[PDB]
Every structure is written in structure tokens, then in C-alpha cells.
């Protein structure tokens, strides 16, 4: 788990995201889709986006960014006591959306990148360590629910 000081760094960093949740969410998803184009094929409603300009110009992609980060932010604020929130999220992603756990590693990397890009010099080594722990905890709990389902991809 994370210590109290680590959770405090995670939620301090999350305050940066909440100042502009749709814009963080857009950029994180665009980083995901452009770095890993197989991820976009999972999204019937984003599969039409052929260029990064089209991605940036999609209001619906910003709206999804809002939904995705709002879910993540509520989970983070549980400081690891997140079973009731996380289990349905994992089950939805395995059974309906068919999202391999590797995509959660991809978006975790994208969050760290986007945080440095939007907050350069204001996301220090301690804060990156804490946020990395929180994202590992989230994906590892999701991975345990996928194992229950026997879900691979």
C-alpha cells in the first residue's frame, strides 16, 4: 500500500488534474491512442478519429476524458479502500470493453507523461513516486479481478 504521506502527495498532484479535468483527460487519452493505436480500436465511438488534430477537436473525447478521470479520481480519494468502486469498473472493462490489463499499464505511463508535460518542474521525484504507487495499486487490483474472470484480452 501507500503510506499516509504518499497518499497526501497523490491527492495533492490530483488537485492539478481537477483544475482542468477534461483537458487532462483529453491529453491522457490522446497520448494513449497515439502511442498505442491498438487501444483506439477498442472505442467504437473514437475509431473514426484518424489524426491527432481530429482527436484534439473531438468534444466527445474531452467528455470521455472527464468521465474516465472522474472515476479514477474518486477511486484515488478512497486511498486504497476502493473495492466497491473498483470491482465494477474491472468487470465492465473485462466483460464489455475487452480491455487487456496492458492498456492500464499504457495509460499509467501516459498519466505520468502528461503530468510532466503540463506541470514541468512542478511534479517532483517524491510526487511521481507516490503517484506511480497509486496507479500500480489501481491496476494491480483490477488485475486480480481479471484473474477471477479468467480474462486475458
Curated annotation (Swiss-Prot):
Heme b binds at residue 93. Belongs to the globin family. Keywords: Cytoplasm, Heme, Iron, Metal-binding, Muscle protein, Oxidoreductase, Oxygen transport, Phosphoprotein, Transport. Monomeric. Its main location: cytoplasm. The modification Phosphoserine is found at residue 3. It is found in: Cytoplasm, Sarcoplasm. The keyword Kinase does not apply. This is Myoglobin. It comes from Equus caballus. It catalyses: Fe(III)-heme b-[protein] + nitric oxide + H2O = Fe(II)-heme b-[protein] + nitrite + 2 H(+); H2O2 + AH2 = A + 2 H2O. Residues 1-147 form the Globin domain. Gene3D superfamilies: 6.10.140.2100, 6.10.140.2110. Nitrite binds at residue 64. GO terms for molecular function: heme binding; metal ion binding; nitrite reductase activity; oxygen binding; oxygen carrier activity; peroxidase activity. Its EC number is 1.7.-.-, 1.11.1.-. It is an enzyme of class 1 (oxidoreductase). GO terms for cellular component: sarcoplasm. Monomeric heme protein which primary function is to store oxygen and facilitate its diffusion within muscle tissues. Reversibly binds oxygen through a pentacoordinated heme iron and enables its timely and efficient release as needed during periods of heightened demand. Depending on the oxidative conditions of tissues and cells, and in addition to its ability to bind oxygen, it also has a nitrite reductase activity whereby it regulates the production of bioactive nitric oxide. Pfam families: Globin. One of its GO terms (biological process) is removal of superoxide radicals. The gene is MB. O2 binds at residue 64.
